[PDB]
Amino acid sequence: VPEYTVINNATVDLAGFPQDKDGYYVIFDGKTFNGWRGYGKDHVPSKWTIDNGAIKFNGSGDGGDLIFTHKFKNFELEVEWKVAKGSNSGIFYLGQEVATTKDGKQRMEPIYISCPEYQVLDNENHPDAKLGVDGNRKSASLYDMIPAVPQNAKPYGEWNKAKIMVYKGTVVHGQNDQNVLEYHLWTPQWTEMLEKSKFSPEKWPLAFELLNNCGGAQREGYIGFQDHGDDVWFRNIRIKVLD
């Protein structure tokens, strides 16, 4: 349970983002990075680019995770995602910006110790596919806790549809228009899933604390995308706030 700080940085208003006919805010205009910032940074990392109306991570600028600068709570996110052959990325939700102080200097902690990830992956050609228990490291899974069933991912190079819903602590992941798992935050079963994971209280104290109390006191958090050194695209990014 170390000394941790949560950084509070400016969040944009949703008013600035148009809403579509079904009520979903469009938080990527297909042309610009308005509303987006690199986690732990004051600027869009340069390996993130706009390619053909997609946000794209240029594998091989500075890198790091990219977030949208609005804290969501009850919401339904929809995204399309394409990976290149062997690509790894992911979609983060309820994230917090965290720092610890070691040796009098502030250091950024990764977003994945504060919040869940919906993995993004070429399941056919990437070694993480093999590496969990029961596929919990293949695409759409809650990475290293809960597998996606069914695993209806398309082959690399194609656009996949992702849904992440969080409603009053209930979470559902969607892939290509099926719901593929469900869990419940801030419960003992949640506590348990964490004790089985790499975020176990013994294997990683500060992660367990943040994940068990996911979304802080106010249960709200940033959405974002993972830099994991590989080529990936996202587009049609929209989010409905829930009422």
215 close to 221: Cβ distance less than 8 angstroms: yes
List C-alpha distances in Å: 71 to 1, 96, 215, 216: 24, 9, 9, 11
User: For residues 123 and 201, what is the distance between their CA atoms, to the nearest angstrom?
Assistant: 29
DSSP secondary structure code for residue 142 in this structure: B
User: Which residue minimizes CB distance to Mg ion?
Assistant: 90
Say whether residue 90 binds Mg ion (CB under 5 A). Answer: yes
Only segment of 41-49, 85-93, 99-107, 181-189 that touches Mg ion (CB under 5 A): 85-93
Provide the b/e sequence for 5-22 (b: ≥16 CB within 10 Å): eeeeeeeeeeeebeeeee
Task: Please report whether residue 221 would count as binding Mg ion according to CB under 5 A.
Answer: no
Task: Supply the minimum distance, in Å, between the C-beta of residue 119 and Mg ion.
Answer: 5
Interface with Mg ion by CB under 5 A: which range of 37-45, 90-98, 150-158, 204-212? 90-98
Least distance (Å) between residue 120 CB and Mg ion: 6
Of 7-15, 52-60, 81-89, 192-200: span binding Mg ion (CB under 5 A): 81-89
Q: Which is nearer to Mg ion, 86 or 169 (CB)?
A: 86
Question: Considering beta carbons, is residue 90 or 224 the nearer one to Mg ion?
Answer: 90
Q: Residue 85 or residue 168: which is nearer to Mg ion going by CB?
A: 85
- Compute how many other C-beta atoms are within 10 angstroms of the C-beta atom of residue 134: 10
| CB nearer Mg ion, residue 88 or residue 212 | 88
CA distance 120 to 122: 7
- Report which DSSP code applies to 85: T
- Work out how close the CB of 91 gets to Mg ion at its nearest, in angstroms, rounded to a whole number: 9
**Which two tokens mark 93?**
């939700």
Q: Least CB distance from residue 13 to Mg ion, whole Å?
A: 30
Number of residues binding to Mg ion, judged by CB under 5 A: 3
Query: In the complex with Mg ion, which residue's Cβ is closer, 110 or 216?
Result: 110
95 lines the binding site for Mg ion (CB under 5 A): no
Helix%, strand%, coil% for the chain, nearest 5: 10, 35, 50
Q: Cβ(120)–Cβ(142) under 8 Å?
A: no
Q: Which stretch binds Mg ion (CB under 5 A): 26-34, 84-92, 162-170, 182-190?
A: 84-92
CA separation for the pair 98, 102 (Å, rounded): 13
Q: Shortest approach of Mg ion to residue 89 CB, angstroms?
A: 6
Determine the Cα–Cα distance for residues 106 and 76; give it in Å rounded to an integer.
34
| Sites of contact with Mg ion (CB under 5 A) | 88, 90, 119
